[PDB]
C-alpha cells in the first residue's frame, strides 16, 4: 500500500533521507560532482532507482534554500511508478552564478504525490 524501494546502483549513491520527522520529502543526493551553469541547466547523477508506493508517482521537487540562494529550480521531475532506470536530477539555474555540486550534496527532494492513475477517459460533447 505504501513501501518506498530504493536500488543503489553504485557505492556513490546515498539512500534518500527525511530532514525532519514530518517533512514532505526525502532528500536526494548527488553521486558525482557537477556544475550547473548560470542561466543554464545540468543533469545531476544520483546512482539510484526507486519504485514509489501504489497510488503515487515520485515528484522530484526543489529544495527551498537552493531556490532562494542559488536560483535553483528542478526540471522534469515526474518519476512514474513503472520507471526503473537511474533517477537523475534536472536542475535549471536561474541565477548569474554557476552552481557547484559535490558528490554527497542534497540537490532536491523526493515527494510521493498521491494521484488518480486509473481514471476512465470519457469523451463528451460539452462540459458542465
Amino acid at each position: 500500500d505504501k513501501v518506498l524501494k530504493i536500488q543503489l546502483r553504485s557505492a556513490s549513491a546515498t539512500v534518500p533521507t527525511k530532514g525532519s520527522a514530518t517533512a514532505a520529502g526525502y532528500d536526494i543526493y548527488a553521486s558525482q560532482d557537477i556544475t550547473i551553469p548560470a542561466m543554464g541547466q545540468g543533469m545531476v547523477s544520483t546512482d539510484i532507482s526507486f519504485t514509489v508506493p501504489v497510488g503515487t508517482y515520485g515528484r522530484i521537487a526543489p529544495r527551498s534554500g537552493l531556490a532562494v540562494k542559488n536560483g535553483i529550480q528542478t526540471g522534469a521531475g515526474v518519476v512514474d511508478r513503472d520507471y526503473t532506470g537511474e533517477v537523475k536530477v534536472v536542475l535549471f539555474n536561474h541565477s548569474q552564478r554557476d552552481f557547484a555540486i559535490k558528490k554527497g550534496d542534497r540537490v532536491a527532494q523526493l515527494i510521493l504525490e498521491k494521484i488518480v492513475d486509473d481514471a476512465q477517459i470519457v469523451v463528451v460533447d460539452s462540459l458542465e
Copy 2:
C-alpha cells in the same frame, strides 16, 4: 466518479493517452508553434476537460523535453471547474528555439489528489 471527461474542440485535438501505471496522460499540440530560446510560448491543445472529484489537473513537464530541449511547464494548475481550452505554457530555458508541430506531445496531465475542501481557520499561534 473517477472519470476524466474530455471535450475535443477541433479535429486537430488528440484525446489524451496514458502504461496503466504511468502518472500522466499525454497532452498534444493542436497547432504549430515555436517556443523561443530563453523565452516562452502558449501551446494550443483544442481540448478542455473535467478532472475527477478530489483532484486537480496538473500540466506537468515531459522528462524527455526537459533534458533534450530545456523545456519546463508554466502555470499548470487546472481547476476541476475550468471548462475553457487547456493551453500549455512552456518556458524554453535552452539556447535553441523549440519547434512544435501539430500532433507533438508537449506535456503530461497528472490527476493530483488534493484536499479541496479544508476549512480556513485563523488562529493566534500555530505553535499554540
Copy 3:
C-alpha cells in the same frame, strides 16, 4: 472535516481565499517588491500556516501571471510542521520587471495529498 490553520503575522497580511472546486487558496503579498527581468525575488506574505494531516502545502503559480509576466513559482514545498513566515519565491522569465504591491495576489496554495509516512526498503532489483 479537514482544517487549514492560518496565522496572520501582521495587519498587512491577507487570509488566503478560495469557489469550492478550485484547487488552490490565493496567496497575497503583504509588502511591495519588484521581481527583476530574468531574475527572482522573495515576496513577503506575513502569514504562516499548518496544512491538514496527509498533505504538504504547495506554493503554485497563478496562470494569468505566468502568461503575462513570465512568472513561475520557485521552492514551494511547505512542510506541515513549518511555522515560519511563508515567503513566495518568484522567477521572472520575461524581459519586463514585475511590480508587486501589498495586497496583490501572487501565487496559490494547494493542499497536495502525499504519502508522508512511507518506509524505505533497499533492494538489489526493482
